[PDB]
Amino acid sequence: EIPKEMLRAQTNYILLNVLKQGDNYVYGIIKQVKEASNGEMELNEATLYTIFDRLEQDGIISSYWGDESQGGRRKYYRLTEIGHENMRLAFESWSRVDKIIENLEANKKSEAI
Amino acid sequence: EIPKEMLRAQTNYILLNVLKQGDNYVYGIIKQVKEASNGEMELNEATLYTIFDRLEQDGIISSYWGDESQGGRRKYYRLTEIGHENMRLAFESWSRVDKIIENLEANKKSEAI
């Protein structure tokens, strides 16, 4: 199977990349994820809010109330500076990792000679 | 920073890719990781054994005693069938994820028109 922790990591990554594209609210995020996935990934609100409560508590995203021109309150989320930085540190750390793995295949092969 | 959970995920991935290259023991694994990383990643044995105890408990790797031609016992580790499969499920799930993220950038851009 795919371990829960890995799923969670995936969902995190995706959701942060939606915010990267712009401040958004629950139903916008879900729709965007559904379209970009062909409906193969349909987030719940429960899930999205459980994740965001965690990201917000750790200061990676922040929330704010939208215009009430609509006449009803809507909560928006954005990536924070720390947010942006972690996404950057993460991305780079992973590309080093992918290099290390190239090098393992390389070194293996090279000693087949 | 890079969250501990992400570091752990990285170290897992790397270690499993070493076993992928062949059955190995602690000091072989460490050396191989150190060479493929330029010494930028020097695993402890403590760490390696804490991780492997977990992987082995979850049936992703298995261990066995090496030849005692050496005259001393050495423990080897190998990836299991389940091991190989999880590495495959994982890898594929991540490439879907990377696609989803392409599609988010794509969809964003496309509606700038």
Author numbering:
A (entry chain A), B (entry chain A): 3 to 115
Article, verbatim:
We used this improved OTS to incorporate aY via amber SCS at position V15 in the LmrR protein. Remarkably, while V15aY exhibits the characteristic LmrR structure, forming an open pore at its dimeric interface of similar shape and dimensions as observed in other LmrR structures, the V15aY_RNYW_KK structure appears to be more closed and exhibits a narrowed cavity. Furthermore, a significant difference in the rotameric state of the aY side chain is observed (S11†). In the parent structure, the –NH2 group of aY is oriented towards the side of the pore, away from the central W96 and W96′ residues. Strikingly, the opposite enantiomer of product 3a was obtained when compared to LmrR_V15pAF (further referred to as V15pAF), albeit with low yield (entries 2 and 3). The results showed that directed evolution led to a 3.4-fold increase in apparent catalytic efficiency, with (kcat/KM-2a)app values of 3.3 M−1 s−1 and 11.2 M−1 s−1 for V15aY and V15aY_RNYW, respectively.
In previous work, we have introduced pAF into lactococcal multidrug resistance regulator (LmrR), a small homodimeric protein harbouring a pore that exhibits promiscuous substrate binding capabilities, either by direct incorporation using the dedicated orthogonal translation system (OTS),19 or, preferably, by introduction of p-azidophenylalanine (pAzF), followed by a post-translational Staudinger reduction. Incorporation of aY into protein scaffold LmrR gave rise to an artificial Friedel–Crafts (FC) alkylase exhibiting complementary enantioselectivity to a previous FC-alkylase design using p-aminophenylalanine as catalytic residue in the same protein. X-ray crystal structures of the parent and evolved designer enzymes suggest that the introduced mutations cause a narrowing of the active site and a reorientation of the catalytic –NH2 group. Position V15 resides inside the pore of LmrR, and is the same position of ncAA incorporation as used in earlier works featuring pAF as catalytic residue.
